[PDB]
Each structure stands twice: as C-alpha cells, then as structure tokens.
C-alpha cells in the first residue's frame, strides 16, 4: 500500500496519438504557400515564436518571421537567399541553422541563419537520391532530416542496405555521422517516418483514411517491431510530417494547411 508519485523521465515509447487538429492558416494574398517550420532548440536572436517558410523549381528563398503576428499576416521580417537549391521535403531548422539536402545531390548543408552562411556540407555516404529510394508514393523523398529530443537525424537508404531504412545521428555543428543504424524496414513500404525519443516510427499511408503508425525501430536495442497505433488522415493528403520535440506534437502539412497530432509517451 506504500504509494509514490507517478515518476516520469519525460521520454518513452509512443502509446497514443490523438485525432488531427487543424491549425489556423496564415494569410497570403499572393499564391506563395510553402511548408513552415519552427526551431525545437531556439537560439538567440530567434525565439520559440520564430517561424520560417520555404518558398514554393530552383527553390532558393526562405522567409523568416520574427513574430507570430508577422507570420499570421504573411509579412516576413527577412528573406534568406540560399547559395544552392533545396529539396523542400526534407529540410529542418535546428539550433539556429537550416539543414537541407542540396538539390540533385546526396549532400546535407548547414546554413546558419543569423550570419546567412554555410557552415558545413556533408555527403551522406552511399545515400540514394532522386527517386532511387522513395517512400511508398514516389517523388524525391530519398533523404529526410528529422529532429527529436536528442537532436538531428537523417533518414535515408543505400544500395548496400537494398532499400532498407538507414538512420544516422548527425553532429549539428560539423554534420559528422556520430552513429548509424541499418534497420530491416523497407523504405518504400511506408509513407513517411519520424523519430521520437530515439525511436523511429513509420506512417502506414497518407491516402487511407484510417492508417496506423505501423513500425517502430528502437535505436537503443536495434530491434524493429510492428505497431497498430491508429493514425487518422483527414485532408487533401498530407505531404510530410515533422515531430517537434519542444511542443511534443506531430505536425502534418498538406501543401497549404497544417494539422497537429497530440501524443502520449510511456514514463520509460
Ligand atoms: Na519526411
């Protein structure tokens, strides 16, 4: 009968995903309406409030909005012109830098936003690019950057892995692959992937209404397992999903509107 408070480390396995809630979309009186992103490790001079938006190929513009009020009005505080075209599907902002795959390359670039400067470039060894290793619906999603509680990751595959998902933990400063895992999950058999507390999760489908989170790979054990967590698709097909470890929510983008999925983890 001796009782203790409910202990919690703040991280654990995913046990519940909520139904999608649609966020209010920002105003743009023009066409422009690219994917937007916030920094899970805000770094001065930016804050939790700061937003960035990718323009729309030759994608080379990134809009920066200091205040949510400026974001919601569609009025950037600064427009970044990047030194090389982007792959919009796998870019992320982390610790004050934009990390992105250079168009038609296997190279990840670190672009420091406050100095508008390339600080690191790293070819992902063996990484396929250009529809060599898509997810389950074509396009050019070969290389996918992700941020979780432990920092920056890259999701990809290689000819050596024969299409299996490979993940590498990246040094956020110099982009070295500090650790690599070769999973036994076939990349083209899932629609998308994200990472929470060091576990890789996959989305079964974006075009089925009642989809699931259907695989998990624990990087602490190297073991993959099947899951059946319900995952509701409610819109014009999401085109990408990002976990934000600061907000502890999943953000799904459908090319205009953003929805959020609440989650619950074990105390683990
Ligand atoms: Na993705």
Numbering used by the authors: 235 to 290, 293 to 504
Q: Could you pull the original sentences from the published paper?
A:
Olfactomedins (OLFs), modular proteins containing an OLF domain that are predominantly expressed in neural tissues, are involved in fundamental processes of cell growth, cell signaling and cell adhesion. High-resolution crystal structures of the ∼30 kDa five-bladed β-propeller OLF domain are available for four subfamily members: olfactomedin-1, latrophilin, myocilin and gliomedin. While the folds are nearly indistinguishable [Fig. 1(a)], one difference is the presence or absence of a heptacoordinate calcium ion bound in the central internal solvent-filled cavity of the β-propeller [Fig. 1(b)]. To survey the OLF triads for calcium binding and to test whether calcium binding can be reverted by simultaneously altering Asn428 to an acidic Asp or Glu, we replaced the triad Asp–Asn–Asp with Asp–Glu–Ser, Asp–Asp–His and Asp–Glu–Lys via site-directed mutagenesis of Asn428 and Asp478.
For myoc-OLFN428D/D478H, nearly all residues were traced; residues 291–292 in monomer A and residues 292–293 in monomer B could not be traced, although several loops in both molecules were difficult to model, suggesting overall loop flexibility for this variant as well. The far N-terminal region adopts an extended loop conformation, forming crystal contacts [Supplementary Fig. S3(d)] with (i) a side helix of one symmetry-related monomer A, (ii) the outermost strand of blade E in a second symmetry-related monomer A and (iii) two loops (439–446 and 468–475) of a symmetry-related monomer B. For myoc-OLFN428E/D478K the difference upon the addition of calcium is within the error of DSF (±2°C), suggesting that myoc-OLFN428E/D478K cannot bind calcium; for myoc-OLFN428D/D478H a marginal stabilization was observed with calcium, suggesting weak if any calcium binding. For myoc-OLFN428D/D478H, the coordination environment is most consistent with a pentacoordinated metal ion, assigned in our model as Na+; consistent with DSF results, this metal ion does not appear to be a well ordered Ca2+, as poor thermal factors and/or occupancies result when this metal is replaced with Ca2+ (not shown). In sum, unlike myoc-OLFWT, neither myoc-OLFN428D/D478H nor myoc-OLFN428E/D478S copurifies with a fully occupied Ca2+, but both the Nematoda triad Asp–Asp–His and the Arthropoda triad Asp–Glu–Ser appear to be able to support metal-ion binding, perhaps in certain bio­logical contexts.
